[PDB]
Amino acid sequence: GKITVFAAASLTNAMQDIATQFKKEKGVDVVSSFASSSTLARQIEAGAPADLFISADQKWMDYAVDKKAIDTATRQTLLGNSLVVVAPKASVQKDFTIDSKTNWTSLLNGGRLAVGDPEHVPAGIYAKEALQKLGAWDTLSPKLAPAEDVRGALALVERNEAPLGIVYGSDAVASKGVKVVATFPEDSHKKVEYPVAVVEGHNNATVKAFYDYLKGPQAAEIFKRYGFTIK
Numbered sequence: 001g002k003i004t005v006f007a008a009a010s011l012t013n014a015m016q017d018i019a020t021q022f023k024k025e026k027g028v029d030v031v032s033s034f035a036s037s038s039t040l041a042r043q044i045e046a047g048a049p050a051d052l053f054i055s056a057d058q059k060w061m062d063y064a065v066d067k068k069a070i071d072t073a074t075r076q077t078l079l080g081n082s083l084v085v086v087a088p089k090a091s092v093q094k095d096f097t098i099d100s101k102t103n104w105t106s107l108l109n110g111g112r113l114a115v116g117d118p119e120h121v122p123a124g125i126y127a128k129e130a131l132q133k134l135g136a137w138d139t140l141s142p143k144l145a146p147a148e149d150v151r152g153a154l155a156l157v158e159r160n161e162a163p164l165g166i167v168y169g170s171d172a173v174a175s176k177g178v179k180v181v182a183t184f185p186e187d188s189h190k191k192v193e194y195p196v197a198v199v200e201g202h203n204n205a206t207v208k209a210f211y212d213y214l215k216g217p218q219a220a221e222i223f224k225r226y227g228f229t230i231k
Contacts, residue, residue, distance in 0.1 A: 005032040006040040008056035009149035013174045014226040036149040038120035051202040056122035061195040071198040079194040080229035082169035085182040088160045112145035114156035114165030123150035127166040130188040173227030
């Protein structure tokens with residue numbers, strides 16, 4: 001039959017390849033919707049008939065659980081990731097270090113810093129927490145180029161519409177157009193974690209077999225090659 005997965009936009013390439021292999025080996029079509037985890041959790045609350053939800057943070061899974069929208073016994077942390085700064089591939093921007101004295105103003109040179117919208121996109125929330133911790137937020141908040149999800153922020157940098165952007169380490173792996181120029185210290189922000197859960201009322205043998213496959217070795221291979229860490 002058919003399975004619908006709502007997945008954080010950073011999972012795009014990994015989930016597409018997983019769906020391909022799952023169809024090949026088991027016959028079932030997996031159709032994913034990719035968007036900010038916030039948008040997808042709100043769609044699920046409203047009644048969108050997703051079978052599985054994978055969030056780029058604990059926050060928006062918590063939100064869907066609190067709304068009684070999730071089969072909570074299935075909830076498990078699946079993946080981790082790093083938070084990075086990226087530049088267009090061709091840019092001459094050097095690697096730099098991120099600390100309380102980083103000269104963000106200098107690095108941007110009058111350009112914007114592409115981010116997932118920090119009002120709700122997990123990549124933006126992680127970014128804001130870090131820049132607040134580091135004392136850079138009041139300097140950088142006027143210079144942001146927010147995006148509907150972390151892949152829209154990635155696309156701004158790819159197109160050299162922003163000279164730097166904050167995206168996940170895995171997003172740099174997926175893109176042929178950017179390179180990593182810095183990594184946020186892990187102690188600057190909450191650990192990046194992706195919970196998966198079956199959506200309430202969607203726990204049937206078909207959906208459950210694909211849920212199990214996500215936690216399995218074929219999926220793990222694909223996730224690792226796309227720059228996710230396996231929990």
